[PDB]
């Protein structure tokens, strides 16, 4: 009897890419905000538009 | 003998004994006292007689029941005094109704039902009406007492029987209460060794039995029957034993008798409730006190998770904690089983005990069935001769 | 406080400060203050961060004041920073104050204020006291109608007594500590009954079960009472209204703890361009809050589609005339847990 | 209950059996790990030519024997009393008293330990076994493992009045 | 029928008949073994088949580790008994869970004595959670439910 | 049954108390007694076992 | 100072000059014990004067003084059945000190400790107890 | 609540009630275990459930290694006791650290006797830091703070 | 301060107060451990904290291997004592080295008795240097310098 | 305190009990690891027909017994005194003196070790157990493990004056 069940949910890491701009420094101050254990975690919404 | 300077000065004040605090057997003495000085509470706890005499006066009939309760081995007790006047030397019929109307009053029913520590009640003042009372006046006092043991779960009533044998058989037959299993009647009045050894004071028997109920609770649990144990300070039952041989009835209502065995002491003989055996299960005193011991210790487990989400999880935490306690009572020799499915059983599921609306109404229904044991009151020898089966080696 | 002159150690004593530990939670009791108190100014709300900060204000502790024994029993049980507002200006300061989730009648009568203050739109849940006299089965119809029937209030009858106090201690003091000590441990959705009282608090009047059978129906009065196994504990989880929507305080307190944490979760949507990409950024900011509340066991059900729903959109919930008036109507539904009030025990004697 | 502190073993030597004269004390550094009390009674079985009933008579009840071990130390920084001082104090209890020409009567006691209904263990030292280990290079010993063996010698005016309360004359 | 998976579980403690619902999050639980000890007795002319005599039952030892968290009534219990204050018993209810977070089977572990308590080691060189490998010895085990 | 008696009638020949694990109040919390008895049975019981084994008549 | 026959000349009484209106420093040994734990907690608190006054150097003071008061409690010194009944210390930034007392540069430690009583009176009662022999 | 990580720690020593703030940099610390020893007593007719009797508490052994550095008051302490001069005690305060370098919980290890001291081996063939695996036996442990 | 690396070292021998500067090239050296032996004594009513009693110090055993080279005054010393001729002592000075080939710290190992001497195995199937795993027991160790 | 150097075991043999004549010394190469002193006292329990009081009388206090082991060596490069020289010196202390026709009186002493309030252990050798191992191929022994067993014989003019300071006449 070849029972198959789905088990553990596997991890999710997404990779989102941006050109740099002369005044805007936005992605670095998120990777700089991390001290030892915690970051300010945000939520991402992606949406195909008109 | 300098009492203010530091040293070793002996005093007359008696300090208390180290109490053991037996939780499942503690009496109240509801009777007339001479002093009545306590102004804070309703019913107060006493520990010794020397603490009681300072707290409730001296030289009354209710003191000699406390004095005999602390001699037979009881260590804690409550006293709820009646607020009316102390009666005469003999009880008049105009005054004996004032006691039983005070036993139906809510002034003494609220102090018992509000305290929730007492497990059995008793009146030592009912034997005060044994002289010059006039038969139905005794039954009017018993029906008041057995009703008083209905205010809250764990209550029992030890109660006095009349000394006259015709009056005892009539009050057994003409009782007619629907709560008879909460009582037990012990027949003869004891002649204790307190003055007025020549004329020892005649005493209620129930003050001594409440100490040996507490004494057999300390070592052999509630499941052991309180009969066949010696009484300390008594000389004799004031009535003969052979005169009361018609008090025990195996088919009708049976009344517990106090026997005098030569060389073996004065003993309680019989553990029966007031009961007319039409297939009744609460026939013996120990069966009524065991099944009310497992209600009052399953409510302490079921109180711990009132106001819980009532899902399928909090039933398995209730079906698991009560199964683990009833098995712990079964492995102490308490429940008559060769295996655990023969001794007891509990059921709690949403399709076994409760409906789908009883979950919506917010109630759990637990169904505990449990077997109990029998006390071995009759023993029958047969004496057969058996050289028939020696079988030629 | 001693002045410091030389660098070193000072051995100065201070007898009997009765010191308690500082605590952090999310439950902020506005304490009503009687007008004869001197260390309060009206049309002002002073803030008490810990028991040492109150004791800095009043100077020294005395067990005569109905407020002084009130805030000690609050910080002995739950803690958290509280606002001390005088009663005669309490109607102006509570709409002013943010971080207000429960309004405590300390020892005063607020029944005229709660009728205008507590609204469906606001986020308060007041608590006040039962009568300080003994009440029986016979007086069950008289003292029950002395309160209003709003679903935003809870009544605890038996006033407290403690060994360190002389005046009786009002039970809305300790019940704001209990509301803040249970929300940290078991979350908001669990009932704040069946929990012990710390600080040596003891009830004044013994309550029977047959007494509590008449004060649980209708405009219910929750009661605290001591038991043999554990000691004194809270034994009620019913609000004043007896409809099935808001009957239990954990239902009313969850919906009030939801709304204060939704409206700060999607407060970015203010003065944003009101079109469609603002809307799905709003329905997603709510939906992964409610999912995080779903996984902790706060809502009933088994799936995420029987648990909650967030539905917005043009024509689904808002009309076109509501767009150019500047209105985003949001419909959110929840399914909270109900507690088990009764447990009955059926004792068969004959085992099969 | 009231407090929380170590009760320590003390051996009080008395010159007489009754306990009236005092000869000196010795408090232990560390308590013993275990205390072993050994009782013994001698029974002789009666032989008879006629009958075959198994019935053993009573001959003598040998006295009790307590056996405890102690350790003394001076390596550690907490303790500074030298072991020559304490072993001189201990051998002066297992010693022939020049006043009475016998050994001295010891009374071991510590805490709430009743030694079968006596607060002390009255008896004299039957043996003593010092085992020096770990000397300094000054040859001062820094660890000593004494093994005491006592035998019970209780007072007679105590044992006269236990018989009277057990079997009175009237 | 079909087997079940081993990564939904909760374990709640009972401190002196007072339940402890704050401490149900554990990393792993040891799995409950019991064994009937057996004395083999070989005899006489029977030298072709063994003969095993039963003996007492030897219950296993329950270990369970969790990440180190804020101090709780579980941690105050182990610290009270492993600092020599009070030797007290605690009952453990270990249950499997369904998909709807309903219990399949539960093991009640009566009178479990907390034996040892061990944290993971600090190290600066690797990134891992500090865990609390705490191990307690029970003296009876009463399986209860469906799907054992 | 201790070979056909419900009890073991006899007196104590030895007794060996081994105190371990005291409290710091020096109350002992564990004690391992070793009893050694020797059989002293009643004579009026053993008089009547001989009569049923070898009777006079 | 009393003269006991056969027992020598003895000091009899350990009392300070005191009028007992709920006073705690009634006996000589209570005044000398509480001044023994000031003069041995100052020797621990002197060791880290001029330290950065962060949250770290309080836990090194709350740890070293808790470890010494427990070492005095386990010698029979402080009247407790458990360590939370004998003594207690508190040092936090929201328990004892304010935010200005950190800015002023001071630590506030609050040591409470229980003490013992000397047993100067002894009272014998002598009650007779054949009442409770209870017929074996 | 949420667990903590195991790569922020400092351990300071107390040499005769004089603190030692020079020696807080360590590679790893062993993690502190204590165990209540248990004697199982099986008895009589009870051959279906065990019965465990408590005994004395057995504390663990604290090892902690560091890179070999300039000589310090820690190193002069171990060299003094392991050359047979003076058997002296030293108290150890091991604390976790927050993100703001505040202590979460601290373990005070009273009267810790320095037992052994071991360097890593030289070898010409591999590149690694010389470490000082030094191990000391404490006789009591008093946990203090929040988040144990 | 900053740690040091473990692949610069030299070890010179002292044969009867005559130094041996030909034999400083070694593959690895064992790293020097010493340990204070400890007898735990549990006592009386103190069953919540241990009590450790010091004992004698147990020094480690120094192993050091080198590639097999031309015969030297080191090899003539081991061959003299392990052929039963003469039981003689030899003092070993093991020192770390700086970048400028200056010594950081040195360990002097007085009266080291050469115990064993073991070559690697020949094998035709693999290519490796024949080494001389030679191991000698010292009876005292006196650390000297900075950066221990 | 003042210096740091090994005190070593010396056994001085005297021909008489008082310690006036000297018969020779022997200093140990390496000190013993451990020193075990064993005391013993004999008590006889009084039997009586009438009473049952447990009271054991005192019979005799057996003398002390010191038991030490030594090792002698000539393998090592540090030591060069041969073991035939030292074992001849040691057997001449456990030897029948031809002057007094008895054995000689030994006085073991080293450092600040008091042997329960005497700086020396005065007594004679009761046993001696040489265990030769590891000979050279010249059959000279290079390792010897002696086990000495002494029994205490102390002077009488010392013990006469301890009784007078313990129980004086006046």
Short mmCIF file of C-alpha atoms in Angstrom, two decimals, chain H residues 25-147:
data_model
loop_
_atom_site.label_atom_id
_atom_site.label_comp_id
_atom_site.label_asym_id
_atom_site.label_seq_id
_atom_site.Cartn_x
_atom_site.Cartn_y
_atom_site.Cartn_z
CA UNK H 25 35.16 37.36 25.04
CA UNK H 26 34.58 33.61 24.69
CA UNK H 27 34.11 31.32 21.69
CA UNK H 28 31.57 29.01 23.32
CA UNK H 29 30.13 28.16 26.74
CA UNK H 30 28.93 24.64 27.58
CA UNK H 31 25.32 25.26 28.55
CA UNK H 32 24.22 24.63 32.09
CA UNK H 33 22.60 21.32 33.05
CA UNK H 34 21.45 20.08 36.44
CA UNK H 35 19.97 16.69 37.20
CA UNK H 36 18.06 15.20 40.13
CA UNK H 37 19.47 11.73 40.74
CA UNK H 38 16.75 9.11 41.09
CA UNK H 39 16.73 5.68 42.73
CA UNK H 40 14.02 3.45 41.32
CA UNK H 41 12.44 1.26 43.99
CA UNK H 42 10.27 -1.61 42.75
CA UNK H 43 8.18 -3.24 45.42
CA UNK H 44 5.85 -6.01 46.40
CA UNK H 45 2.82 -6.69 44.30
CA UNK H 46 3.09 -3.42 42.40
CA UNK H 47 4.60 -4.78 39.19
CA UNK H 48 2.78 -2.57 36.69
CA UNK H 49 3.98 0.93 37.56
CA UNK H 50 7.36 2.25 38.62
CA UNK H 51 8.15 4.18 41.79
CA UNK H 52 11.01 6.66 41.72
CA UNK H 53 12.66 8.02 44.86
CA UNK H 54 14.46 11.36 44.69
CA UNK H 55 18.07 11.84 45.70
CA UNK H 56 20.72 14.57 45.63
CA UNK H 57 21.00 17.03 42.74
CA UNK H 58 23.98 16.62 40.41
CA UNK H 59 25.12 19.85 38.77
CA UNK H 60 26.87 19.85 35.42
CA UNK H 61 30.38 20.90 34.50
CA UNK H 62 30.98 24.24 32.81
CA UNK H 63 33.42 24.24 29.90
CA UNK H 64 34.23 27.39 27.99
CA UNK H 65 36.86 27.96 25.34
CA UNK H 66 38.39 31.13 23.97
CA UNK H 67 41.12 32.09 21.57
CA UNK H 68 44.46 32.43 23.27
CA UNK H 69 45.08 36.09 24.03
CA UNK H 70 47.40 38.33 26.03
CA UNK H 71 47.79 37.25 29.65
CA UNK H 72 44.93 38.46 31.85
CA UNK H 73 43.61 38.13 35.43
CA UNK H 74 41.64 35.08 34.27
CA UNK H 75 44.78 33.31 33.06
CA UNK H 76 46.74 34.24 36.19
CA UNK H 77 43.97 32.61 38.23
CA UNK H 78 44.05 29.23 36.44
CA UNK H 79 47.84 29.21 36.40
CA UNK H 80 47.91 29.88 40.14
CA UNK H 81 45.59 27.00 41.04
CA UNK H 82 46.88 24.47 38.47
CA UNK H 83 50.49 24.94 39.57
CA UNK H 84 49.56 23.84 43.08
CA UNK H 85 49.94 27.23 44.74
CA UNK H 86 46.47 28.10 45.99
CA UNK H 87 43.11 26.35 45.74
CA UNK H 88 40.80 29.33 45.36
CA UNK H 89 37.21 29.79 44.27
CA UNK H 90 35.87 32.09 41.57
CA UNK H 91 32.27 33.03 40.84
CA UNK H 92 31.09 33.13 37.22
CA UNK H 93 28.26 35.27 35.85
CA UNK H 94 27.12 34.01 32.43
CA UNK H 95 24.52 36.16 30.74
CA UNK H 96 22.66 36.19 27.45
CA UNK H 97 22.46 39.50 25.60
CA UNK H 98 19.75 41.42 23.77
CA UNK H 99 20.00 43.38 20.55
CA UNK H 100 20.69 46.58 22.51
CA UNK H 101 23.37 44.66 24.50
CA UNK H 102 21.10 44.33 27.52
CA UNK H 103 21.02 41.06 29.49
CA UNK H 104 18.03 38.79 29.10
CA UNK H 105 18.88 36.17 31.72
CA UNK H 106 22.01 35.58 33.77
CA UNK H 107 23.31 32.46 35.51
CA UNK H 108 25.43 33.02 38.61
CA UNK H 109 27.69 30.05 39.30
CA UNK H 110 28.83 30.31 42.89
CA UNK H 111 32.20 28.95 44.06
CA UNK H 112 33.36 27.50 40.76
CA UNK H 113 36.57 25.53 41.18
CA UNK H 114 38.91 25.61 38.15
CA UNK H 115 39.45 21.96 37.31
CA UNK H 116 41.26 21.64 33.97
CA UNK H 117 42.84 23.79 31.27
CA UNK H 118 43.72 22.52 27.81
CA UNK H 119 45.05 24.25 24.72
CA UNK H 120 44.42 23.12 21.18
CA UNK H 121 47.18 21.28 19.40
CA UNK H 122 49.75 22.87 17.17
CA UNK H 123 49.85 21.54 13.65
CA UNK H 124 51.71 22.91 10.67
CA UNK H 125 49.33 21.46 8.12
CA UNK H 126 46.09 23.28 8.95
CA UNK H 127 45.12 26.88 9.65
CA UNK H 128 43.09 27.43 12.81
CA UNK H 129 43.08 29.55 15.94
CA UNK H 130 44.79 28.20 19.03
CA UNK H 131 42.02 27.91 21.60
CA UNK H 132 42.05 27.43 25.38
CA UNK H 133 39.53 24.75 26.33
CA UNK H 134 39.34 25.53 30.05
CA UNK H 135 36.79 23.73 32.20
CA UNK H 136 35.70 24.54 35.74
CA UNK H 137 33.36 22.85 38.21
CA UNK H 138 30.74 24.95 40.00
CA UNK H 139 28.87 23.88 43.09
CA UNK H 140 25.66 25.91 42.81
CA UNK H 141 23.75 27.69 40.07
CA UNK H 142 21.24 30.49 40.62
CA UNK H 143 19.35 31.48 37.50
CA UNK H 144 18.29 35.14 37.47
CA UNK H 145 16.08 37.22 35.19
CA UNK H 146 13.49 37.04 32.44
CA UNK H 147 13.57 34.64 29.45
#
